[PDB]
Design a protein around this ligand. Structure first.
Ligand code: DGD
Ligand code: DGD
Ligand code: CLA
Ligand code: CLA
Ligand code: CLA
Ligand code: CLA
Ligand code: PHO
Ligand code: LMG
Ligand code: LHG
Ligand code: 8CT
Ligand code: 8CT
Lengths: 36, 51, 45, 342, 35, 30, 154, 52, 39, 38, 65, 77, 32, 28, 334, 36
């Protein structure tokens, strides 16, 4: 039916760049908040 | 044989422990810091930080 | 079998390497004072 | 003047040799009865009608083999009150059915509650933070899980640990054989916590004793310390340097060091309690399914885990006949697993 | 197998020689209370 | 007469009773 | 290690007495050497000269001696004869295997062709070096030398 | 699941009762503790008015 | 009234009059007798 | 009103805590991977 | 602090923070109710434990019929 | 306050009442064991009472609410 | 294929150890 | 009145005597 | 100006290296790195090992069907015994892998490395001007590792009886050891269990007493750990407060007034406990087993009345008759 | 043999808390950097 280990591909390829963007945004927001 | 072997293995290990204790204390008493670190001249405080 | 040596070629490094280390150590020791002291250890280096 | 409650509160919180407090009313009688019942069980009370065992000094047992044995399996999870429907007020029959174990277990549960309340009360009166009661929640978790929640998930009180030494060893081997508790990862975390707590205790003691300041001229350095002094008695900088260049990492914060010493054994005990609670319902890490499948498909495939499984089978089969006498297990010599048998 | 044996013998002899002649090199003087 | 007296005597009278009982049990012919 | 045993494997009294002669000669010569000499400069730099240091040196020496004597008592049957100290673990296991071998060779059982549960020798098997040794779990103790078995050993 | 959750929430209850009854010493203790911890200094433990 | 229920009621009464009443009464008497000087 | 909440507090995590958390999570994964897989 | 209709409706229901009854108040009757609750819990625990057998109360799966 | 140890150990009454009471407790325990009273009180079998003539097996109690009757049947004679 | 996961987890743990040793926060004394 | 070291010695000897009788009863 | 050897000795004994090397480290670093390398590669990919010597290999590596828990570096063959088995003493490398040579390599290098670690702890205690008894504390786990890796094989005559370098192998070692020696009834193992339980108890006790009596030096919006500054002169917690709390908890001299004596006790209890349990394993290597209380209670006739020791004996018999299948051809296990 | 979808469990349970810790550390470090 549906090939396995594609769940890993879809979920990791969704998570890792999302993780990267969330980390960047939180880092930038905290740097702005500390600038004040 | 079991009694002699076990007793003398016990005593050999115990006297290795004694050797380590007395060799360490002999070195520390010869160098002169067997009673603790001198507060006035602490050797670590005069060293560069390691990281 | 002394020191686990079955081939005579094994004796060459076992004897040779300590000789070179002893040569370096002997240079170090010839740099020293080498007279008797009355203390628990020698503070001269 | 004052009310009666205020006078009782003043007398209970008196600064005497043995502090009583409000927690003392629960602690002292319950702990006294627990210890007294344990001594009475290990001294006089038999186990002949519950386990078919001798577990008292009256029967000829020593300190290792004497125990307050668990009740009979037929009792179920009865509270086994002296006035209860099993004993019906007969102290002799109450001792013969294992009711003294329930006496000790319930009184010890409430005595642990009382001692933790005592820690809270003394910490509140003295004025310090109550981290000792949080630390003691660990042993409370151990006792609750093992001595109450494990038997309450099993058939009866019979399979709870019996209050002895060889009885506790029997419990260890019984749980290993019937549960493979060494393979349980929560027990692995508990072992890690206990051994790391011993490691921390030894290493902190050695580090403090070996980084002290020279505060006296005597070679024995114990007298060179006063409790009311303001300065530290040992060098944290020297210890940090030593363990940074010996081990790679070292403590630099004393408070974090001591909270870690508090945390490691507590976490170990709580995780092992989770593991025992899991065992209470036979929800176990007994087997790895793929290893068993590969061993069934390939007779030449063998790991140490399969050998452990075989040893557990040996424990169960050679132990159940005399360990659970109420079941009347009659195992012939041919059904008993033997290494030479295959 | 002889080449591996002689390599291992050389390495063990080298490190044991360093150990031995390092502890002979006035190791007790190498302490912060010297001089 | 104090609470310490009671705390000691709780752990003393049965302690002596049990020690005597155990010393008596040491001489039972097994 | 196994099969060699360092100085635990002294198997005759001639070696024992001769090396005790050697030890006596060496000790007397070294004693006069130390009576008439003072430590060299390398020894003066190397060691700590205090009573506790000498005590520690003696402690490590006598600890090594304790280990060596424990192994003497466990393995050696020449300086510790089994008529007095009793058989060693290897000696007891090989005695059991050898007595079963004798009882089966005398009472009708071909021991050299009796295949074991794993295809190995049940009574007599082949050593990792190729010798004929006693089979079973006593194959680990094939280095045993005993006066009651050496006449029967080719 | 619920036996383990109840066991863990027992620890949680202990922690939050401790943080409730000891709110004033959350960040540590002061210099007013040294007089109370002397053995026999006060008749009632922790009460400054019961000094001997 | 089963024997178990009668035993339960008797257990409550015995617990009261053997544990709670004597301990509480002694606590009350000693607290009223041995007071604390708050001067 | 919709604006500065006075209860806003910063959140910290020093490198020691980061390394402890990484070690904890990786060791837990090492421990429980054998049991999740079987 | 903005004022709403629901906020003004519920304001009297949250308006007495810190208001206490002087002295011991209702503590004795509270303790009496707690004692009754303790007895009730003990009764039902001993019923479920079969340490307390009551007429026409069969603690069994078979009582479902 | 507290009672010091010297006042405890130098009290004349403290020694005479102990000398008249504590050996009495010791002998009381000795006679509690030696007269067979402990076996009867706690139900511990005598060395000749583990097995009877009719029962040569382990006396297991197999019912909860009739345990007293079963124990009386097993321990009779 | 789970062997790869085991090796990855073990190597990640060792990398965490490496970074905790060599890239640690350098301890310094404060000017309090 | 009596020095404490004599009391400690007598108590230690009596404790060791209790240990000895318990061990003898274990062996008999 | 100095000689090359003097500069080499100054670099080796330097306190400016991130990790101190020292002369004991000269022996320690290569041995520990060799053991680590061989252990990693043999745990990942090593062929099965005939541990019992009966030509029935046991798989221990990840590539041969093991997880982290069941994986282990199998001990060497019983055919080898305690014969020295390096790579060059085998006919081929695969013969060395078949007979468990990696176990001997890892064990020897690891024991040398931990002895070097003891010496290196002493050495950096000496270079810093501190008291050198942390190595005495570390001798206890080294003693236990030696007992389970070298002494027990020496006592039993085979490196196959050492503890496997794994988890399930460790459990198998424990079970077989209990079956054959009854370690639970051995008083030295009981002292070791008391040592670890008391070490946990005292670690938790000391940590809770210090954390309970921390001196207020922080605000409510930060961790309490920042009240202590690295290198400060004053004490960060009230020792008198903790002493008073613990004196009122049990009794007024159940506590240690002296912090130095308290920390000596902390370092003393578990070190002595582990010393005693390691020596107990060392003595059971030569078959001086634990307490045997089997059939200690008989009735008037003489029928055996079982005790808890007899049920423990039944469990030990269950483990005994199942361990090392088809390796026993004789009734007794001598 | 080895059950599938346990790869997802192991990898996600490893990643997500690691992600949380990395984000916390980077946020804290950037707030400290902007505090200067
Ligand atoms: C790595 C380098 C380390 C060297 C350690 C080797 C291990 C010692 C060993 O396997 O020891 C055993 C050997 C004894 O060897 C045995 O010696 C025997 C000698 O008996 C022979 O000879 C006898 C003569 O009567 C009998 O005839 C006997 O039948 C016959 O076989 C056999 O050769 C055995 O095969 C052989 O194993 O002891 C020896 O060589 C002498 C004793 C060495 C000291 C003992 C080591 C103690 C362990 C370290 C202590 C750790 C403690 C913790 C510290 C922290
Ligand atoms: C933490 C801080 C606190 C520290 C502890 C403080 C000390 C507390 C002391 C109280 C100890 C509780 C004792 C409760 C006794 C018990 O459980 O007694 C058990 C009885 C249930 O009785 C059992 O019930 C079983 C089910 O039977 C049923 O089914 C049978 C089917 O054949 C028959 O039909 C039978 O008639 C019918 O009752 C069997 O009958 C058993 O033989 C019988 O013992 O419940 C009852 O009394 C009450 C059970 C519900 C109350 C919940 C109590 C918590 C128990 C949760 C743990 C159990 C789950 C284990 C998970 C792990
Ligand atoms: C703080 C003290 C304290 C506490 C908490 C307990 C607690 C307990 N005891 Mg206990 N006990 C105590 C002191 C205490 N005891 C003392 C001092 C003695 C010596 C006389 C005993 C002798 C004793 C025996 C002989 C037995 C217990 C048992 C029990 C358990 C069952 C309780 C039960 O069902 O009783 C019912 C509840 C009560 C009696 C509470 C009192 C009722 C209150 C006052 C309300 C009354 C109102 C009513 C209308 C009148 C329970 C854990 C039993 C046990 O362990 O079973 C295995 C058991 O058989 N106790
Ligand atoms: C208990 C036995 C014993 C002890 C403790 C010593 C101790 C010592 N010997 Mg020695 N020695 C001994 C027996 C002993 N000897 C015997 C029996 C002989 C005869 C073979 C010698 C022959 C000997 C020589 C030839 C030398 C030493 C030397 C030394 C010193 C340094 C040794 C070293 O670093 O290694 C040291 C004081 C050295 C030294 O300092 O000379 C005085 C040295 O050169 N020894
Ligand atoms: C509790 C203390 C204690 C006790 C009771 C023993 C008891 C014993 N130890 Mg021992 N030991 C101990 C502690 C103890 N040890 C400690 C702490 C260590 C250090 C680890 C050792 C290390 C040790 C070793 C290394 C050895 C013993 C051995 C022995 C046994 C014989 C001792 C002997 O003859 O040496 C006597 C030694 C002397 C130097 C005495 C002088 C002998 C010269 C006289 C020559 C006699 C000659 C033949 C007669 C000539 C006759 C003439 C007409 C020609 C004996 C059972 C021996 C043994 O059997 O090992 C298993 C042995 O080899 N011990
Ligand atoms: C009704 C349940 C409940 C509630 C509302 C709280 C609320 C609180 N707890 Mg708390 N706690 C609870 C149960 C609860 N706890 C239980 C059962 C335990 C025992 C394990 C604890 C142990 C505990 C400790 C030890 C501490 C708190 C603290 C706190 C406060 C800070 C919030 C916090 O830790 O988040 C911080 C954020 C996290 C913890 C996120 C990390 C993710 C966790 C670790 C794992 C993910 C869990 C999953 C989902 C949960 C499933 C659910 C069914 C349980 C907060 C007031 C802290 C405090 O008082 O500080 C002043 C504190 O130090 N709690
Ligand atoms: C075998 C292990 C073990 C034992 C025996 C033990 C014992 C003790 N721990 C105490 C404290 C502590 N334990 C702590 C942490 C730990 N304790 C641990 C493990 C143990 N702790 C571990 C692993 C930790 C790490 C988390 C802390 C933090 C404390 C304390 O604050 C306290 C102390 O002061 O330390 C010195 C002492 C006083 C508390 C108490 O219960 O007395 C009161 C008596 C009671 C409650 C009666 C107990 C009744 C028991 C439960 C049932 C009956 C048992 C029989 C009487 C005996 C059974 C015989 C056996 C052989 C089976 C007590 C001696
Ligand atoms: C003295 C100790 C302090 C020394 C300071 C130097 C520290 C050195 C660190 C030790 C590392 C050396 C490892 C070599 C040991 C080894 O196994 O060699 C292995 C070799 C044997 O080597 C094997 O021998 C076999 C014999 O058939 C075959 O030839 C094999 O091919 C060969 O590998 O053994 C020796 O060289 C032993 C030398 C004599 C040592 C006996 C004393 C040991 C007993 C006391 C120690 C325990 C107490
Ligand atoms: C008991 C009677 C209670 C009684 O006499 O109350 C009177 C007592 C207070 O008496 P005083 O006269 O000091 O107090 C003045 C009162 O009018 C209240 O302020 O109340 C308390 O002490 C309550 C605390 C104990 C409450 C818990 C026990 C309640 C009993 C439960 C059964
Ligand atoms: C259970 C029950 C029945 C009905 C009444 C009641 C409801 C109240 C309830 C409780 C009854 C009670 C409280 C009974 C009290 C029993 C008590 C306190 C028994 C205590 C016995 C004390 C004993 C042996 C002493 C043992 C000490 C020994 C050997 C010494 C050991 C030694 C140590 C410590 C170090 C090594 C050397 C040495 C000398 C061996
Ligand atoms: C043959 C046999 C059968 C049975 C009986 C019999 C006695 C005959 C037996 C033996 C006979 C003989 C001749 C035995 C001889 C044994 C000998 C020579 C033992 C000598 C061992 C030497 C040892 C430890 C040396 C220890 C010194 C060391 C590490 C180094 C010390 C120092 C230096 C020099 C280097 C740096 C480190 C440090 C500490 C500064």
């Amino acid at each position: 039916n549906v090939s396995v280990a594609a769940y890993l591909a879809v979920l990791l390829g969704t998570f890792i760049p999302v993780v990267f963007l969330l980390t960047l945004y939180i880092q930038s927001e905290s740097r702005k908040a500390a600038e004040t | 044989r079991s009694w002699l072997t076990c007793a003398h293995f016990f005593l050999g290990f115990a006297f290795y422990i004694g050797h380590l204790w007395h060799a360490g204390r002999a070195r520390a008493a010869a160098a002169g810091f067997e009673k603790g670190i001198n507060r006035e001249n602490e050797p670590t405080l005069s060293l560069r930080p390691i990281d | 079998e002394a020191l686990g040596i079955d081939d005579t070629r094994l004796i060459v490094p076992v004897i040779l390497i300590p000789v070179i280390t002893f040569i370096l150590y002997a240079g170090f020791a010839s740099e020293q004072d080498n007279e008797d002291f009355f203390d628990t250890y020698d503070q001269r280096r | 003047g004052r009310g009666w409650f205020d006078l009782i509160d003043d007398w209970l919180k008196r600064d005497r040799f043995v502090f009583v407090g409000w927690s003392g009313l629960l602690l002292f009688p319950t702990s006294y009865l627990s210890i007294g019942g344990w001594f009475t069980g290990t001294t006089f009370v038999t186990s002949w009608y519950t386990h078919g065992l001798a577990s008292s000094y009256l029967e000829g047992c020593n300190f290792f083999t004497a125990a307050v044995s668990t009740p009979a399996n037929s009792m179920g999870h009865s509270l086994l009150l002296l006035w209860g429907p099993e004993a019906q007020g007969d102290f002799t029959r109450w001792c013969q059915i294992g009711g003294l174990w329930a006496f000790c277990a319930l009184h010890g549960s409430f005595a642990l509650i009382g001692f933790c309340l005592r820690q809270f009360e003394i910490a509140r009166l003295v004025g310090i933070r109550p981290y000792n009661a949080i630390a003691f929640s660990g042993p409370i978790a151990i006792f609750v899980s093992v001595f109450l929640m494990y038997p309450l998930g099993q058939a009866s009180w019979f399979f709870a640990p019996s209050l002895g030494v060889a009885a506790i060893f029997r419990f260890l081997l019984f749980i290993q054989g019937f549960h493979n508790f060494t393979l349980n990862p929560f027990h692995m975390m508990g072992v890690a916590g206990i051994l790391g707590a011993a490691l921390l205790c030894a290493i902190h003691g050695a580090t403090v004793q070996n980084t002290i300041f020279e505060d006296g001229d005597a070679a024995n350095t114990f007298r060179a310390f006063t409790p009311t002094q303001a300065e530290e008695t040992y060098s944290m900088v020297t210890a940090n340097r030593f363990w940074s260049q010996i081990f790679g990492v070292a403590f630099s914060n004393k408070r974090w060091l001591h909270f870690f010493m508090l945390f490691v054994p507590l976490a170990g005990l709580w995780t092992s309690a989770i593991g025992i609670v899991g065992l209470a319902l036979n929800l176990r890490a007994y087997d790895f399914v793929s290893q068993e499948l590969r061993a069934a498909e390939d007779p030449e495939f063998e790991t140490f885990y399969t050998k452990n499984i075989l040893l557990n089978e040996g424990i169960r089969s050679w132990m159940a006949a005399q360990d659970q006498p109420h079941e009347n297990f009659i195992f012939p010599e041919e059904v008993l697993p033997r290494g030479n048998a295959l | 197998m002889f080449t591996l044996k002689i390599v291992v013998y050389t390495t063990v002899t080298f490190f044991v020689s360093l150990f031995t002649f390092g502890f002979l090199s006035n190791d007790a003087s190498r302490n912060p209370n010297r001089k | 007469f104090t609470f310490r007296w009671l705390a000691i005597h709780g752990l003393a009278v049965p302690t002596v009773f049990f020690l005597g009982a155990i010393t008596s049990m040491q001489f039972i012919q097994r | 290690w196994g099969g060699d045993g360092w100085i635990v494997s002294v198997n005759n009294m001639e070696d024992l007495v001769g090396g005790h002669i050697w030890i006596g000669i060496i000790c007397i010569v070294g004693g006069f050497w130390h009576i008439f000499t003072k430590p060299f400069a390398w020894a003066r730099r190397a060691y700590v000269w205090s009573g506790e240091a000498y005590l520690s040196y003696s402690l490590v020496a006598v600890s090594l001696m304790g280990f060596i004597a424990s192994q003497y008592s466990w393995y050696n049957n020449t300086a510790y004869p089994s008529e007095f100290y009793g058989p060693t673990g290897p000696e007891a296991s090989q005695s059991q295997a050898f007595t079963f071998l004798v009882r089966d060779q005398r009472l009708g059982a071909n021991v050299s062709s009796a295949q074991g549960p794993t295809g190995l020798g049940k009574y007599l098997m082949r050593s990792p070096s190729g010798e004929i040794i006693l089979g079973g779990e006593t194959q680990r103790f094939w280095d045993l030398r005993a006066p009651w078995i050496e006449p029967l050993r080719g | 699941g619920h036996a383990n959750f109840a066991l863990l929430f027992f620890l949680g209850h202990l922690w939050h009762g401790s943080r409730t009854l000891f709110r004033d010493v959350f960040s540590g203790i002061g210099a007013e503790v040294t007089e109370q911890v002397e053995f026999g200094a006060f008749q009632k433990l922790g009460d400054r008015s019961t000094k001997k | 009234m089963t024997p178990s229920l009668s035993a339960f009621i008797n257990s409550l009464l015995l617990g009261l009059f053997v544990v709670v009443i004597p301990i509480g009464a002694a606590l009350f008497l000693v607290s009223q007798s041995d007071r604390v000087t708050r001067t | 009103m919709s604006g500065p909440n006075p209860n806003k507090q910063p959140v910290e995590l020093n490198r020691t805590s980061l390394f402890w958390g990484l070690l904890l999570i990786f060791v837990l994964a090492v421990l429980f991977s054998s049991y999740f897989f079987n | 602090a903005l004022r709403t209709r629901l906020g003004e409706l519920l304001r009297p229901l949250n308006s007495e923070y810190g208001k206490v009854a002087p002295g011991w108040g209702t503590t004795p009757i509270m303790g009496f109710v707690m004692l009754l609750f303790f007895l009730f819990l003990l009764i039902i625990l001993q019923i479920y434990n079969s340490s307390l057998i009551i007429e026409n109360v069969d603690v069994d799966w078979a009582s479902l019929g | 306050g507290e009672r010091p140890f010297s006042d405890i150990i130098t009290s004349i009454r403290y020694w005479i009442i102990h000398s008249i009471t504590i050996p009495a407790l010791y002998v009381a325990g000795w006679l509690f064991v030696s007269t067979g009273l402990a076996y009867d009180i706690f139900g511990t079998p005598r060395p000749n009472e583990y097995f009877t003539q009719d029962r040569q097996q382990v006396p297991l109690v197999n019912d909860r609410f009739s345990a007293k009757q079963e124990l009386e049947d097993l321990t009779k004679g | 294929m789970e062997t790869l996961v085991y090796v990855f987890l073990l190597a990640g743990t060792l990398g965490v150890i490496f970074f905790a040793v060599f890239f640690r926060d350098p301890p310094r004394i404060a000017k309090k | 009145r009596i020095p404490l070291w004599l009391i400690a010695t007598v108590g230690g000897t009596l404790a060791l005597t209790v240990v000895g009788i318990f061990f003898y009863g274990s062996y008999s | 100006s100095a000689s090359a050897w003097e500069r080499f000795c100054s670099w080796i004994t330097s306190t400016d290296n991130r990790l101190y090397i020292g002369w004991f480290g000269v022996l320690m670093i290569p041995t520990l790195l060799t053991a680590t390398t061989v252990y990693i590669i043999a745990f990942v990919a090593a062929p099965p090992v005939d541990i019992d010597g009966i030509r029935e290999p046991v798989a221990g590596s990840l590539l041969y069907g093991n997880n982290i828990i069941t994986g282990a570096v199998i001990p060497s063959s019983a055919s080898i015994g305690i014969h020295f088995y390096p790579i060059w003493e085998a006919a081929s490398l695969d013969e060395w892998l078949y007979n468990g040579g990696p176990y001997q390599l890892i064990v020897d290098h690891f024991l040398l490395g931990v002895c070097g670690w003891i010496g290196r702890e002493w050495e950096f205690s000496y270079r810093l001007g501190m008291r050198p008894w942390i190595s005495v504390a570390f001798t206890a786990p080294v003693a236990a590792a030696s007992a389970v890796f070298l002494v027990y094989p020496i006592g039993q005559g085979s490196f196959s009886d050492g503890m496997p370098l794994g988890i399930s192998g460790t459990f198998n070692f424990m079970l077989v050891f209990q079956a054959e020696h009854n370690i639970l009834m051995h008083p030295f193992h009981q002292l070791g269990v008391a040592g670890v339980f008391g070490g946990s108890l005292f670690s938790a006790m000391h940590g809770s007493l210090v954390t309970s009596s921390l001196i207020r030096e922080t605000t409510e919006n930060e961790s309490a750990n920042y009240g202590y500054k690295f290198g400060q002169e004053e004490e960060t917690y009230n020792i008198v407060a903790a002493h008073g709390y613990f004196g009122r908890l049990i009794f007024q001299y159940a506590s240690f007034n002296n912090s130095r004596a308290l920390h000596f006790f902390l370092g003393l209890w578990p070190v002595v406990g582990i010393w005693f349990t390691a020596l107990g394993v060392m003595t059971m290597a030569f078959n001086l087993n634990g307490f045997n209380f089997n059939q200690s209670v008989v009735d008037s006739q003489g029928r055996v009345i079982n005790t808890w020791a007899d049920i423990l004996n039944r469990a030990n018999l269950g483990m005994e008759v199942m361990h090392e299948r088809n390796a026993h051809n004789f009734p007794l296990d001598l």
